[PDB]
JSON list of C-alpha atoms in Angstrom, two decimals:
[
{"chain": "A", "resi": 11, "resn": "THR", "atom": "CA", "xyz": [71.79, -86.25, 82.29]},
{"chain": "A", "resi": 12, "resn": "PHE", "atom": "CA", "xyz": [69.71, -87.98, 85.28]},
{"chain": "A", "resi": 13, "resn": "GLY", "atom": "CA", "xyz": [67.41, -86.03, 85.97]},
{"chain": "A", "resi": 14, "resn": "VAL", "atom": "CA", "xyz": [69.15, -82.86, 86.71]},
{"chain": "A", "resi": 15, "resn": "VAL", "atom": "CA", "xyz": [67.71, -79.86, 84.34]},
{"chain": "A", "resi": 16, "resn": "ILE", "atom": "CA", "xyz": [72.03, -78.53, 84.67]},
{"chain": "A", "resi": 17, "resn": "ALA", "atom": "CA", "xyz": [73.51, -81.43, 84.38]},
{"chain": "A", "resi": 18, "resn": "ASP", "atom": "CA", "xyz": [70.73, -82.83, 81.54]}
]
């Protein structure tokens, strides 16, 4: 989430 790939 949020555009951060590792955070999805």
